[PDB]
């Protein structure tokens, strides 16, 4: 249940990022002071063990902006990139 | 922000370089408002970059 809610939350966070730039700040608060839900949410932020197209796009730039914010301990980023690389008839 | 830092850096190095600035003065090249409008109309609301 916190996995699906977290995907709806990251969707909203990314489309706020689009309408803006510079990291929706609800999320940056939740990061430092809701670490449990930060990691239950940050699994969906790295649920793109999927084709990363040639050009940077929403998800790409969103996660680049986070790793510039010095969040994403490099363990989960390495994981992300690795998973990404992928008669009767 | 945008695609490769080297393309970005290349553009800025060219922009700062002097002989580009000395060329931009005597100018048919100085991008008339009408020419500006022709390029801005050429581009779409579809693939923006902005």
């Amino acid at each position: 249940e916190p996995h699906s809610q977290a995907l709806q939350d990251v969707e909203k966070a990314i489309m706020v990022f689009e309408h803006t730039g510079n990291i929706p700040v609800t999320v940056m608060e939740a990061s430092i002071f809701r670490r449990p839900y930060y990691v239950s949410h940050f699994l969906p932020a790295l649920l793109t063990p999927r084709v990363l197209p040639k050009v940077p796009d929403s998800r790409v730039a969103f996660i680049e902006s986070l790793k510039r914010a010095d969040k994403i301990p490099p363990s989960l980023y390495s994981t992300y990139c690795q998973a990404c690389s992928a008669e009767p008839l | 922000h945008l695609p490769s830092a080297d393309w970005q850096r290349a553009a800025l190095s060219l922009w700062t370089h002097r002989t580009f600035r000395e060329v931009l003065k005597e100018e048919d090249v100085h991008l008339t408002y009408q020419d500006w409008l022709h390029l801005e109309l050429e581009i779409q609301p579809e693939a923006d970059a902005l």
Partner: protein, 50 residues
């Protein structure tokens, strides 16, 4: 994967911009319906911290 967000229609916001100028000149003390609508949507939302 929801992969950012799409636009749809920058046309229809122009079709609004028209009706806005029209009613506005038709009036020209009383207060606009926009701020009313804004209050209704903010109220119909959840009041939580989530």
């Amino acid at each position: 994967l929801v992969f950012g967000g799409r636009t749809g229609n920058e046309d229809i916001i122009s079709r609004l911009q028209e009706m806005v100028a029209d009613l506005e000149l038709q009036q020209d003390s009383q207060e606009h319906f926009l701020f009313e609508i804004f209050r209704r949507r903010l109220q119909a939302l959840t009041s939580g911290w989530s």
